[PDB]
Amino acid sequence: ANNLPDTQSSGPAHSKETPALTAVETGATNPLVPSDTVQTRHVIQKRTRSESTVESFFARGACVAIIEVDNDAPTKRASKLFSVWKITYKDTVQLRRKLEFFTYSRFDMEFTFVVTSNYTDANNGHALNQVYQIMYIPPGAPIPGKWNDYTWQTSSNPSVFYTYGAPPARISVPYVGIANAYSHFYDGFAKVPLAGQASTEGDSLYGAASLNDFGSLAVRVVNDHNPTKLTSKIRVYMKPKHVRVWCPRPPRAVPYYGPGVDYKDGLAPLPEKGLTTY
């Protein structure tokens, strides 16, 4: 967020110093300023880079998931009375691309849950205000098997009970990585296959570290069902905070295809433009 250097007055030049000429082969960028190649006036620079700090770049809540749940009679096998969403930023694209400008990152994370609901039909009465349970299931904790099984006691899991109509729920977590930074890219495997092991052993997905690195969110409607079916969507908004990032990378240029770096479609991003056309 630092200010910018002033432009210094620069007059005619006639000398053996040639800042214009360089050698990009060295791998360095020629740090020229306008006064190196043209005559410049004195300008007291007042612009700053306050809004391009990494913190400012990521200081936005981005939607990373839309978790759909129902409030309906359990006999209705079509309805889904609870939903489990594995935590990740890779279900949407925008925040993913912003994060993947970099190879490593540390940040606290602010989760904000925006809950919307609606009737599905109009001939089965009405509903009282719903309460939603959002339980964090860290890896290894038992995953709910039913909307009302014992796991929802949440004696040790953190849970947020959100009352419909209240302002979106919000919680914060610190940096919870087991490494010293989050790895946006992992060039490796969880397993190394060993010679003599059958083809079904030692095989792991390329670039995946843990089968379950950050656990899940289990969402249900706590209320018992009304005579009419209600559908709800919980939109999850992530905001990195206190961000640090390492090893910048070129941003994604073609559409994402899965959680890896794979690509299948849209491999022609650049449009056509004449070489000598302005």
Partner 1 sequence: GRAGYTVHVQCNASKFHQGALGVFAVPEMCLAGDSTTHMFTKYENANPGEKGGEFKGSFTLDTNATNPARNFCPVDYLFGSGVLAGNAFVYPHQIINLRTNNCATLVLPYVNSLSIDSMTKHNNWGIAILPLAPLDFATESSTEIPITLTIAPMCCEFNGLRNITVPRTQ
Ligand X SMILES: CCCCCCCCCCCCC/C=C/[C@H](O)[C@H](N)CO
Ligand Y SMILES: O=C(O)c1ccc(NS(=O)(=O)c2ccc(N3C(=O)c4ccccc4C3=O)cc2)cc1
- Using the rule CB under 6 A, is 173 a contact of ligand X? yes
Q: What does the alpha-carbon distance between residue 139 and residue 150 come to, in Å, rounded to a whole number?
A: 17
We find the least distance from the C-beta atom of residue 4 to partner 1, in angstroms, to be 22
Closer of 161 and 206 to partner 1 (Cβ): 206
Task: Tell me the number of residues near partner 1 by CB under 8 A.
Answer: 54
Q: Among 66-74, 119-127, 168-176, 196-204, which window interacts with ligand X (CB under 6 A)? A: 168-176
- Using the rule CB under 6 A, is 65 a contact of ligand Y? yes
For the chain, give the residues followed by a break (C–N over 2.5 Å). Answer: none
Longest dimension (CA), the chain: 89
- Specify the residue for token string 């490796």: 188
Closer of 66 and 73 to ligand X (Cβ): 66
Q: Among 46-54, 58-66, 125-133, 202-210, which window interacts with ligand Y (CB under 6 A)? A: 58-66
Given ligand X, partner 1, ligand Y, none, residue 141, with its beta carbon under 5 to 8 Å by kind, binds: none
Q: List residues bridging with 183 in a β-sheet.
A: 104
**Closest by CA position to 76, among listed 115, 38, 44, 124:** 124
Q: What does the alpha-carbon distance between residue 259 and residue 10 come to, in Å, rounded to a whole number?
A: 52
- Using the rule CB under 6 A, is 106 a contact of ligand Y? no
| Half-sphere exposure in the Cβ direction for 190 (13 Å, CA) | 11
Alpha-carbon 78 to chain mean position: 31
Closer of 147 and 256 to partner 1 (Cβ): 256
Which residues sit at the interface with ligand X, rule CB under 6 A? 87, 89, 109, 111, 134, 136, 158, 160, 171, 173, 176-177, 182-184, 209, 213-214
